[PDB]
Write an enzyme that holds these catalytic residues in place. Structure first.
Site, PDB file in Angstrom:
ATOM      1  N   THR A 159       0.588  -1.205   0.149  1.00 12.57           N
ATOM      2  CA  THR A 159      -0.135   0.033  -0.046  1.00 12.57           C
ATOM      3  C   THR A 159       0.691   1.321   0.272  1.00 12.57           C
ATOM      4  OG1 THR A 159      -1.710  -1.383   1.377  1.00 12.57           O
ATOM      5  CG2 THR A 159      -1.789   1.210   1.111  1.00 12.57           C
TER       6      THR A 159
HETATM    7  C1  LIG Z   1       0.323  -2.565   0.609  1.00 10.61           C
HETATM    8  C2  LIG Z   1      -0.165  -3.389  -0.745  1.00 10.61           C
HETATM    9  C3  LIG Z   1       1.424  -3.447   1.242  1.00 10.61           C
HETATM   10  O1  LIG Z   1       0.786  -4.641   1.508  1.00 10.61           O
HETATM   11  C4  LIG Z   1      -1.081  -2.362   1.580  1.00 10.61           C
HETATM   12  O2  LIG Z   1      -0.454  -2.174   2.860  1.00 10.61           O
HETATM   13  C5  LIG Z   1      -2.265  -3.446   1.358  1.00 10.61           C
HETATM   14  C6  LIG Z   1      -3.483  -3.119   1.895  1.00 10.61           C
HETATM   15  C7  LIG Z   1      -4.586  -3.750   1.565  1.00 10.61           C
HETATM   16  C8  LIG Z   1      -5.605  -3.048   2.304  1.00 10.61           C
HETATM   17  C9  LIG Z   1      -7.168  -3.712   1.925  1.00 10.61           C
HETATM   18  C10 LIG Z   1      -7.136  -4.681   0.757  1.00 10.61           C
HETATM   19  C11 LIG Z   1      -5.993  -5.114   0.426  1.00 10.61           C
HETATM   20  C12 LIG Z   1      -4.768  -4.582   0.781  1.00 10.61           C
HETATM   21  N1  LIG Z   1      -1.889  -4.486   2.178  1.00 10.61           N
HETATM   22  C13 LIG Z   1      -1.881  -5.962   1.698  1.00 10.61           C
HETATM   23  O3  LIG Z   1      -2.156  -6.290   0.434  1.00 10.61           O
HETATM   24  C14 LIG Z   1      -1.496  -7.058   2.683  1.00 10.61           C
HETATM   25  C15 LIG Z   1      -0.180  -6.828   3.065  1.00 10.61           C
HETATM   26  C16 LIG Z   1       0.059  -7.432   4.354  1.00 10.61           C
HETATM   27  C17 LIG Z   1       0.201  -8.745   4.471  1.00 10.61           C
HETATM   28  C18 LIG Z   1       0.236  -9.385   5.677  1.00 10.61           C
HETATM   29  C19 LIG Z   1       0.547  -8.610   6.866  1.00 10.61           C
HETATM   30  O4  LIG Z   1       0.506  -9.296   7.975  1.00 10.61           O
HETATM   31  C20 LIG Z   1      -0.170  -8.692   9.232  1.00 10.61           C
HETATM   32  C21 LIG Z   1       0.219  -7.352   6.835  1.00 10.61           C
HETATM   33  C22 LIG Z   1       0.007  -6.801   5.479  1.00 10.61           C
HETATM   34  N2  LIG Z   1      -1.652  -8.242   2.019  1.00 10.61           N
HETATM   35  C23 LIG Z   1      -2.525  -9.368   2.722  1.00 10.61           C
HETATM   36  O5  LIG Z   1      -3.187  -9.086   3.845  1.00 10.61           O
HETATM   37  C24 LIG Z   1      -2.810 -10.581   2.196  1.00 10.61           C
HETATM   38  C25 LIG Z   1      -3.667 -10.352   1.093  1.00 10.61           C
HETATM   39  N3  LIG Z   1      -3.295 -11.673   2.956  1.00 10.61           N
HETATM   40  C26 LIG Z   1      -2.335 -12.341   3.891  1.00 10.61           C
HETATM   41  O6  LIG Z   1      -1.157 -12.165   3.829  1.00 10.61           O
HETATM   42  C27 LIG Z   1      -3.030 -13.241   4.908  1.00 10.61           C
HETATM   43  N4  LIG Z   1      -2.239 -13.311   6.070  1.00 10.61           N
HETATM   44  C28 LIG Z   1      -2.829 -11.866   6.769  1.00 10.61           C
HETATM   45  C29 LIG Z   1      -1.912 -11.942   8.262  1.00 10.61           C
HETATM   46  O7  LIG Z   1      -2.587 -13.137   8.966  1.00 10.61           O
HETATM   47  C30 LIG Z   1      -2.099 -14.010   8.229  1.00 10.61           C
HETATM   48  C31 LIG Z   1      -2.795 -14.546   6.800  1.00 10.61           C
END
Ligand SMILES: *[C@@](C)(CO)[C@](*)(O)[C@H](Cc1ccccc1)NC(=O)[C@H](Cc1ccc(OC)cc1)NC(=O)[C@H](C)NC(=O)CN1CCOCC1
Ligand SMILES: *[C@@](C)(CO)[C@](*)(O)[C@H](Cc1ccccc1)NC(=O)[C@H](Cc1ccc(OC)cc1)NC(=O)[C@H](C)NC(=O)CN1CCOCC1
Ligand SMILES: *[C@@](C)(CO)[C@](*)(O)[C@H](Cc1ccccc1)NC(=O)[C@H](Cc1ccc(OC)cc1)NC(=O)[C@H](C)NC(=O)CN1CCOCC1
Ligand SMILES: *[C@@](C)(CO)[C@](*)(O)[C@H](Cc1ccccc1)NC(=O)[C@H](Cc1ccc(OC)cc1)NC(=O)[C@H](C)NC(=O)CN1CCOCC1
Ligand SMILES: [Mg+2]
Ligand SMILES: [Mg+2]
Ligand SMILES: [Mg+2]
Lengths: 195, 222, 225, 212, 204, 196, 222, 196, 195
Positions: free
Chosen positions: D1
């Protein structure tokens, strides 16, 4: 150490380097020059691990100066940058590697062109229109992406550089006590005293 | 991997699958795991792919020099001794698991070597991730006094067990037959029971589909 | 969080045309020590289901008690306990599957791999697997532990897919199972020679065979090595 | 993000990217990172996708319950504090959220609140949140004036996300623009970086680092 | 701190009818920060082309090393090195550093000047040769490239068709990887002409 | 492993199982753990297969070179060479070796060399994982100056029990008889020893 | 220490047309390097024209599907047999997943069906509940292989109109059910070739206004 | 510990050493590891002294309360109560218990309960650290329907060997004879058993 | 958070508190007020863990305000400081302790005396003529030891405070973006706008 920037414009390379030398909770010095002149038309700024930085910079400086005296000839900025990269590329697989990142700004007198090289402690070399090491890049790269033009003058480059320093002074957590700016062009290396 | 070795009447046969992996990804669908140490001594290799190749070549090179020096055809026990002493020296860090087989003036031989430098002797052997699937078949169908054609069948069946049941093995079956008094016959892709079916569609793009910024002729000449 | 103490090794099984076969050796290992030799790891539930259990034996004995209690509870206020409302293999499995997954979700698993073999009331073969993780799956041939690596390859040569099941007789199937048990005795360091075998047929019913031995073993070639 | 929102003469501009990542795997390029809480409130999402998505739509339910109970649209301050007090209860548990509650009310005027998962809540005129926040700041700060026109402010917000989308590996996809006025929020379209970059490069003459 | 995914990048090679193609992205970064959009990963020594993914300092080092070695080869052999021979040289050189390796994923591509046969090969960081009839992939988006190549590829493509296939393979794979992209270069190689094309791709 | 060596009236007998394990998998069920280092000096190998093999090969080389210069080495000498290797490389070795040999002067002799590299001369010795289960049995049943048939039964019954309880042991019972008469190899299959 | 999670492999794929939607998944189930079953379906009809698959750790996958199926049942009881719309199902699943935010279901979830305007719909979820409607999604072990292929062939990414100087993009259009099934079959054969956990069989569930239809195809068993 | 229980013609006999150790120090050289949970149901205790004691006390309490309501409990019942405690608290216990009792219907019975909390009914049982050394011996020498004198000799010779090899075992050999006649305590001192 | 200072002079208590709110490599705000008015003549500054600081400050503020309304009476600075200390003393043995350090500056209207209390997150209370939390103390304590006099005026106290801020701006590694100064005296609490 911490902030070192570089901007290559039409006729010159401009290197900005922070003046602060911090250790623990004390700024020990606020007028530190994080740069060495390798040859009359080649300047290298440096940042990284304490001790390593200056030790490496002066070691490179000695080698380039030795070459200059031996051949009665100045190495091209490209040649110096390749020499430096190789030294760091050796270093990284040593018992104790040099933890030093450098920018090499030079004016090639044969080509009549300014050249800016960015080399990290791993020995990763790239030629760039503008470069930065450490956390600085996270602000300046996007800033320069927007405001930089390849045909700018040295004066325009300095204004572009003021814009970077202002942004860093606004958003960086640490006080880096301003910068020492130096210009590399056809007439050699000179320092801007009022920045 | 899955690799096997089977002794028979007048010699020995080895075989192997042809899959190479990098985690869950199939890197090579038709790699060669059967290696020539000397004309009539061949090696099947499982484990670290580069290690099995490099260690087999090094000993193969030294075996050739030794054969020239002694004016004799090389022996399987020489390759076995050289491989095991090399592997032992490196304390398992060279991850080569080999089935060494071949014929020489002494007779026909079948051995296995582990990465740490221990060697076995047997009439039938199997190594690799699919060795348990293979060994199950070998233990079920092996017998004393096998013929050539029976041993090839048994060997390829043991490899097939690995191909189908082990995820670390797949694609094709390579075989090498080393019979006494004859030339060793390397049977590359002896079985190919995993041919890719015809694709549903041709994905040939209309020319000009890809956007291009620059073109230039590259100079390869002097 | 557990660690298994007294353990049972492979349980192997397969479908054939009229029913299912399941087998498991009579050993209770204590690490490398082959401690107990009179352990029955196949437990019949009614006359139409056999549950084969590997892994921790204390947890197996707990599961025995649960199944025993399930039969009792099913009989309560049930005039058709020995007829239409008798315990089906599918019911017994789903119950165990539920328990196994609930225990893993509470981070306190029953350290077992379980195969429920039986025949349903409509004549269909039932063969399904469940383990300490609550993971379930079904196949024409199922096996646990070393059996999964050595038995399955041999059993799949007989029944490789669904269409091979009607073509497989109880004689052919039992022969494959008994062969697999021999192979496991050669190669599994925590196996024993003595084993039990159970056949649940839709016509002849439950046939429970005890005190079987691995035989016709090839050892003669060892003298030459 | 990369998400930003800044206050100016003509209200509030809000701009976000649309990428979702799982490590270096680009999970999506079309994610909605702005949630429209009501006709006058916006929420931006950065951090864990589930955390952001779940709790901000939950926030919207709390804001709806406020106006049912109080017969009045919730203040930007109160709305942000519901979310901050919630995540503070989960402090240490491992929530990952970087949000900006942007909106207009009569008593407050245009207002922006930064709220994050370690319980920080800050009122301010300019914020950038996300992995590419620094890249957005670089462009935004060096071009920001209070007296920007609605047209110029919209572009600067768009251009700042583009700047970050380019440099930050974990930002990209497309730019979603919003403009908040006294009359409520107004959507100013989805802008794919695939086309927007080249369009900006050509027209603006910028991005000279890239091979044209 | 996984050497093979600090800088990022990808290389892909394909065979066609009497031709080969080798393509790479242009990104060089420091994890999340994109630093350079001009960093080419394909080099050539005579008519033999070598692509190298992985740690950028080693990419540079190996290029310089193989230039060094092929230059001495040519001086002594009095002929250009062939792809099959160069492949062996690469393997030897990588395994020489068995217990302190270069963190790279090299890819050899080229046409044997004697036989006229198209040749491609891949390696792991430790020297294991991966020869292929169809295609070789390497880099941080290798999984993506495997999926793109395996579906899009068909044998005996003409140079102009092969260009479209390899380009689409690289582009769509790169867009699903954070550390790959930022531009792309494709080399179409025929028996005695080579065309180099820079692709227009999304710059995020 | 379960291994043992036993001295008797006419000389000495070595005994071993035939199981090699990689975890709970039996890599080889027909292993030969009785290895020749000299005509009438043999050793039983337990511990790491790779380590014991490398050691045995080096010892065999040393004793062959000894024989070329000074004639037949004593059993004690053979055990000293084993000890020297096991003791000096104790940090990098997992080898428990029993050395047994027949002199005409000294008759049957047995030396055991545990992990540390210490040497212990005994009437009989037991070693390997399966030996733990037969310390009780062997102590009660061993007698000095047994006959050949008695010693064969002693080893067979002992290793039978070791094999029965130890999962790391099994297969066939190999034996090697060292006397003035020469060298005799014996083998005993499961169908015989299991039902003792 | 006890590890409550495991990886049962496989892969799934959802594509949406104009008046239909498909949800496909291979029938292989694995642990480590062993095949558990060659036919263990993981794509389920959950009622109300909603098909669902939760790929990854099968125990959590089955648990989730079981809970959602049960959620559909209680939605009928509590709201006068009202049809659960695909968008409402999606939101419901988010709460199921996020409910276990701090001890997650280890699964990539995909559901497919028709929206309230009769148009094809695919929703996809992360393991903790974040969701998004898309035309296209691959999930599971081979998601990284298949997804970029779909971007190219379903959404026409990186494809420009020939001769337009890379200025005009290839226009977006819905695909016929015949065309979609071709892409599904090619995606899974390609995935089977290069991923060891994918193979054995392919089962596709097609959703139109008329109901849920199934189609099965053999895959390579190595 | 070395402990064992053996069924015979007239009933059952329990046997144990008397050594309690805290490391290599012998905290108590005259320990009574044979403990009464009921008139003619006893148990041998191995593992943690504190755990086995706490368990035995609870079992004794349960069986006393059982007797008050339902009369004399079976040996099986006693073993079930032990199992229930050992199984349900397996994470917090280090107890290996052998349960032995005499019914008039069922005669002598022996149940062994290892670490896991599983139950195993056997003709005879051995347990504790020193038991490893006598698996071979006990298997070869045990016979069903032995006399009292034969069973006493079997236990004495067995525990003698266990004690000889196991450093964690020693002192006196205590025994408890359970028959229809009643309960008899036996003791055997080092000077007798050592020279068997 | 980071820098919070306090100086008690003759007739008033002066609290200085840094304006920077940093997080990672970004200064998110440069005008943050790290203080809450507990009562008309009692002010509490705070520094520490993110979230905790404000959450704790506002919780204390609510309690003191509740007391004021209940009793129609202002608690003495001493009484408030003792209440705050006890809350932190409870906190430290909680499942998750408040990681907040505070200074409480107050004017006791009954005694007609300024009072400055320093309390750390453990619940360690001390009354002081001058106080600081965090690394600031390492510079300011020795500085004030030298220049502080007990009979100084508010104006002299502000000049003494300027001397501290100058020293910190010179030697502290981080840019804390200046301070917000507030004075507590007989007439209540007021903020110095030009510092
Ligand atoms: C940018 C792309 C950097 O990541 C943004 O922060 C973005 C924001 C966002 C908001 C709403 C919908 C989509 C995207 N964040 C992500 O894309 C996010 C990055 C992230 C991953 C893991 C984290 O751990 C705490 C924190 C941030 N991606 C995800 O959440 C992905 C799609 N899902 C996972 O990794 C599943 N994980 C989440 C944490 O728990 C274990 C499973
Ligand atoms: C089967 C297929 C593996 O299950 C075989 O053992 C196969 C053997 C083989 C032999 C000759 C030619 C091709 C294949 N082994 C592999 O393909 C091997 C599997 C493996 C990977 C990593 C290992 O160490 C952790 C051990 C075995 N794969 C490779 O050698 C691939 C090509 N290379 C790597 O994964 C690079 N590794 C090598 C070891 O050092 C770290 C990086
Ligand atoms: C019994 C089986 C167990 O102690 C014997 O000691 C036996 C002795 C033997 C085997 C073959 C030929 C002659 C003598 N030992 C083994 O079977 C041995 C078990 C063992 C392995 C490693 C050890 O410590 C390092 C100790 C005992 N098996 C092997 O060596 C097998 C062939 N290889 C492996 O298990 C691989 N090892 C390599 C060393 O590191 C652990 C993994
Ligand atoms: C033999 C000696 C060794 O196993 C027996 O099992 C014996 C059984 C016994 C002893 C007394 C009365 C009845 C039965 N056990 C001990 O002597 C026992 C050794 C032991 C201690 C701790 C264990 O695991 C937790 C397992 C075995 N000794 C003791 O309990 C002594 C009195 N106390 C300690 O050693 C102190 N322990 C407390 C538990 O944690 C380790 C330190
Ligand atoms: Mg396979
Ligand atoms: Mg980007
Ligand atoms: Mg003793």
């Amino acid at each position: 150490m911490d902030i070192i920037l570089g901007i290559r414009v039409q006729d010159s390379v401009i290197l900005a380097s922070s003046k602060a030398v911090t250790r623990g909770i004390s700024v020990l010095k606020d007028s530190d020059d994080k740069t060495r002149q390798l040859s009359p038309h080649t300047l290298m700024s440096f940042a990284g691990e304490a001790g390593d930085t200056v030790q490496f910079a002066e070691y490179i400086q000695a080698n380039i100066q030795l070459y200059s005296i031996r051949e009665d000839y100045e190495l091209s900025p490209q040649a110096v940058s390749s020499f430096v990269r190789q030294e760091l590329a050796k270093s990284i697989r040593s018992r104790r590697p040099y933890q030093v990142n450098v920018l090499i700004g030079g004016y090639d007198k044969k080509k009549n062109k300014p050249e800016l090289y960015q080399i990290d402690y791993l020995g990763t070399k790239v030629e760039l229109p503008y470069g930065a090491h450490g956390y600085s890049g996270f602000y300046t790269f996007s800033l320069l992406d927007h405001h930089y033009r390849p045909d700018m003058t040295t004066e325009e480059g300095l204004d572009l550089l003021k814009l970077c320093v202002q942004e860093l002074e606004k958003r960086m957590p640490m006080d880096f006590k301003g910068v020492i700016v130096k210009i590399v062009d056809k007439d050699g290396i000179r320092q801007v005293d009022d920045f | 991997t899955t690799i096997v070795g089977v002794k028979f009447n007048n010699g020995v046969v080895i075989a192997a699958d042809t899959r190479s992996t990098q985690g869950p990804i199939v890197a090579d669908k038709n790699c060669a795991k059967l290696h020539r140490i000397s004309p009539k001594i061949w090696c099947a290799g499982a484990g670290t792919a580069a290690d099995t190749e490099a260690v087999t070549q090094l000993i193969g090179s030294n075996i050739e020099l030794h054969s020239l020096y002694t004016s004799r055809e090389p022996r399987v026990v020489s390759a076995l001794q050289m491989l095991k002493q090399h592997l032992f020296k490196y304390q398992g860090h060279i991850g080569a698991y080999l089935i060494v087989a071949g014929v020489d003036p002494t007779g026909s031989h079948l051995f296995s070597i582990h990465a740490h430098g221990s060697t076995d002797v047997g009439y039938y052997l199997s190594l690799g991730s699919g060795s348990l699937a293979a060994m199950a078949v070998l233990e079920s169908h092996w017998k004393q006094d096998l013929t050539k054609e029976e041993a090839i069948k048994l060997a390829s069946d043991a490899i097939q067990a690995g191909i189908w049941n082990d995820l670390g093995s797949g694609s094709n079956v390579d075989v090498c037959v080393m019979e006494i008094g004859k030339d060793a016959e390397y049977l590359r892709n002896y079985l190919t029971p995993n041919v890719r079916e015809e694709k549903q569609k041709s994905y040939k793009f209309p020319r000009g589909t890809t956007a291009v910024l620059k073109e230039s002729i590259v100079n390869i000449c002097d | 969080t557990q660690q298994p103490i007294v353990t049972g090794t492979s349980v192997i099984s397969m479908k054939y045309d009229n029913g299912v076969i399941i087998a498991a050796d009579n050993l209770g290992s204590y690490g490398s020590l082959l401690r107990f030799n009179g352990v029955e790891r196949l437990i019949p539930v009614g006359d139409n289901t056999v549950v084969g259990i590997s892994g921790d034996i204390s947890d197996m004995q707990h599961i025995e008690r649960l199944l025993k209690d399930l039969v009792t509870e099913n009989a309560y206020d049930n005039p058709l306990a020995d007829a239409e409302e008798a315990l089906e293999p599918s019911y017994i499995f789903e119950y165990l599957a539920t328990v196994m997954y609930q225990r893993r979700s509470k981070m306190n698993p029953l350290w077992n791999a379980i195969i429920v073999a039986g025949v349903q009331s409509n004549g269909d073969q039932f063969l399904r697997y469940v383990n300490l993780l609550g993971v379930t799956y079904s196949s024409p041939t199922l096996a646990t532990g070393f059996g999964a690596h050595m038995a399955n390859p041999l059993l799949r040569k007989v029944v490789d897919r669904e269409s091979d099941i009607p073509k497989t007789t109880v004689q052919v199937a039992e022969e494959a199972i008994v062969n697999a048990m021999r192979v496991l005795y050669y190669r599994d360091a925590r196996s024993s020679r003595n084993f039990s075998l159970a056949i649940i047929d839709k016509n002849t019913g439950l046939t429970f065979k005890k005190n079987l031995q691995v035989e016709n073993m090839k050892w003669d070639f060892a003298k030459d090595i | 993000t990369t998400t930003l929102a800044f206050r100016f003469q003509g209200g509030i501009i809000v701009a976000v990217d649309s990428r979702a990542t799982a490590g270096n795997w680009v999970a999506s390029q079309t994610v909605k990172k702005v949630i429209e809480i009501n006709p006058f409130l916006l929420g931006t999402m950065a951090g864990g996708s589930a955390d952001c998505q779940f709790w901000e739509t939950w926030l919207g339910s709390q804001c709806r319950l406020h106006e049912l109970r109080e017969k009045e649209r919730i203040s930007v301050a109160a709305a942000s504090k519901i979310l901050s007090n919630l995540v503070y209860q989960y402090k240490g548990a491992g929530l990952s959220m970087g949000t900006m509650i942007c909106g207009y009310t009569r008593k407050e005027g245009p207002t922006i609140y930064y709220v994050d998962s370690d319980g920080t809540r800050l009122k301010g005129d300019i914020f950038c949140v996300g992995s590419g926040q620094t890249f957005a700041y670089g462009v935004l700060d060096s071009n920001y004036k209070w007296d920007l026109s609605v047209e110029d402010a919209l572009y600067l917000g768009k251009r700042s996300i583009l700047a970050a989308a380019h440099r930050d590996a974990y930002s990209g996809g497309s730019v979603n623009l919003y403009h908040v006025t006294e009359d409520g929020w107004i959507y100013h379209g989805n802008h794919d970086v695939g086309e927007l970059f080249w369009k900006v490069k050509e027209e603006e003459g910028s991005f000279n680092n890239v091979i044209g | 701190s996984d050497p093979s995914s600090i800088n990022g990048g990808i290389v892909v090679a394909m065979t066609g009818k009497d031709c080969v193609a080798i393509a790479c992205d242009l990104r060089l970064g420091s994890q999340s920060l994109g630093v350079s959009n001009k960093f080419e990963k394909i080099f050539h020594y005579g008519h033999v082309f070598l692509g190298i993914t992985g740690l950028a300092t080693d990419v540079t080092t190996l290029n310089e090393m193989f230039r060094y070695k092929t230059n001495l080869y040519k001086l002594k052999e009095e002929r250009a090195i062939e792809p099959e021979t160069f492949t062996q040289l690469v393997s030897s050189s990588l395994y020489e550093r068995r217990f302190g390796p270069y963190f790279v994923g090299p890819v050899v591509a080229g046409i044997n000047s004697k036989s006229g046969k198209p040749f491609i090969a891949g390696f792991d960081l430790i020297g294991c040769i991966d020869e292929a009839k169809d295609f070789i992939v390497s880099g941080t988006a290798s999984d993506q490239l495997f999926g793109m190549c395996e579906s899009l590829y068909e044998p005996n493509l003409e140079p102009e068709d092969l260009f479209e296939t390899i380009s689409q393979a690289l582009l769509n794979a790169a867009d699903r990887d954070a550390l790959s992209g930022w531009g792309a270069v494709v080399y179409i190689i025929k028996k005695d002409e080579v065309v180099k094309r820079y692709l227009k791709m999304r710059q995020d | 492993t379960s291994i043992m060596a036993v001295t008797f009236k006419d000389g000495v007998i070595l005994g071993a199982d035939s199981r090699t394990t990689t975890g709970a998998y039996i890599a080889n069920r027909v292993t030969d753990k009785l290895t020749r280092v000299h005509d009438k000096i043999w050793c039983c190998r337990s511990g790491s297969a790779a380590d014991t093999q490398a050691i045995a090969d080096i010892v065999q080389y040393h004793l062959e070179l000894y024989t070329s210069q000074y004639g037949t080495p004593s059993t004690e000498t053979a055990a000293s060479v084993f000890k020297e290797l096991c003791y000096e490389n104790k940090d990098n070795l997992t080898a428990g070796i029993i050395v047994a040999g027949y002199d005409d002067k000294n008759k049957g002799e047995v030396y055991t060399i545990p992990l540390g590299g210490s040497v212990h001369k005994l009437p009989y010795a037991i070693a390997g994982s399966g030996s733990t289960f037969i310390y009780g049995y062997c102590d009660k049943n061993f007698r000095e100056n047994m006959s050949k048939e008695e010693t064969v039964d002693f080893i067979k019954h002992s290793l039978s029990q070791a094999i029965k309880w130890d999962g790391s042991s099994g297969g066939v019972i190999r034996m090697v008889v060292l006397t003035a008469a020469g060298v005799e190899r014996l083998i005993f299959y499961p169908d015989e020893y299991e039902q003792l | 220490q006890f590890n409550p999670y495991g990886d049962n492999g496989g892969t799934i794929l959802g594509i949406a047309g104009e008046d239909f939607a498909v949800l496909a998944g291979d029938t292989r189930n694995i642990t480590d390097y062993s095949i558990n079953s060659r036919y263990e379906p993981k794509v389920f009809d959950c009622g109300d024209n909603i098909v669902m698959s939760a790929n990854g750790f099968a125990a959590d996958g089955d648990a989730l599907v079981k809970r959602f199926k049960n959620s559909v049942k209680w939605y009928h009881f509590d709201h006068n047999d009202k049809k659960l719309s695909i968008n409402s199902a999606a939101r419901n699943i988010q709460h199921l997943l996020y409910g276990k935010r701090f001890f997650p279901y280890y699964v990539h979830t995909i559901i497919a069906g028709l929206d309230e305007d009769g148009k094809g719909a695919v929703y996809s979820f992360d393991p903790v509940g974040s969701y998004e409607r898309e035309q296209c999604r691959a999930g599971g072990a081979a998601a990284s292989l298949i997804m970029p292929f779909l971007d190219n062939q379903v959404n026409f990414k990186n494809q420009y109109e020939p001769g337009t100087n890379g200025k005009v993009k290839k226009p977006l259009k819905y695909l016929s059910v015949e065309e979609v099934i071709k892409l599904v079959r090619d995606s899974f054969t390609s995935a089977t070739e290069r991923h060891i956990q994918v193979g054995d069989g392919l089962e596709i569930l097609i959703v139109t206004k008329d109901g849920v239809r199934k189609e099965f195809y053999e895959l390579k068993r190595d």
